[PDB]
Write a protein that binds this ligand. Structure first.
Ligand code: NAG
Ligand code: NAG
Lengths: 43, 50
């Protein structure tokens, strides 16, 4: 487990919150995100 | 007129404290589906002070 997504619709038309543990770091963003249809990180 | 300053005139529900809804998507006031296209009872949600 390496992150979380939050929002209302999760389809860019209204804002969404992304939280990620980037190995050592932690990153937080609020954006008009369009996610991929099956979210995961390739490692 | 300076039209660059805008305010929301239409929303489905009232904001809670510091809720910051920026969405520009076309609103529906009517019982008939507006399908994301402008018209009577199918309003653009913002307005300009000019
Ligand atoms: C992500 O983590 C790597 C770890 O080496 C770091 O170099 C990079 O600057 C980080 N980037 C962000 C946006 O956190
Ligand atoms: C928060 O967003 C949802 C999106 O469906 C909406 O139903 C709800 O009324 C919103 N909350 C407020 C206080 O407007």
């Amino acid at each position: 487990i390496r992150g979380w997504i939050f929002g209302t619709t999760l389809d860019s038309k209204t804002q969404s919150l992304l939280i990620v543990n980037n190995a050592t770091n932690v990153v937080i963003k609020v954006c008009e995100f369009q996610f991929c249809n099956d979210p995961f990180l390739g490692v | 007129g300076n039209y660059n300053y805008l305010y929301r005139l239409f929303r489905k529900s009232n904001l809670k404290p510091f809720e910051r809804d920026i969405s520009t998507e076309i609103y529906q006031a009517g019982s008939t589906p507006c399908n994301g296209v402008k018209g009577f009872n199918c309003y653009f949600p913002l307005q300009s002070y000019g």
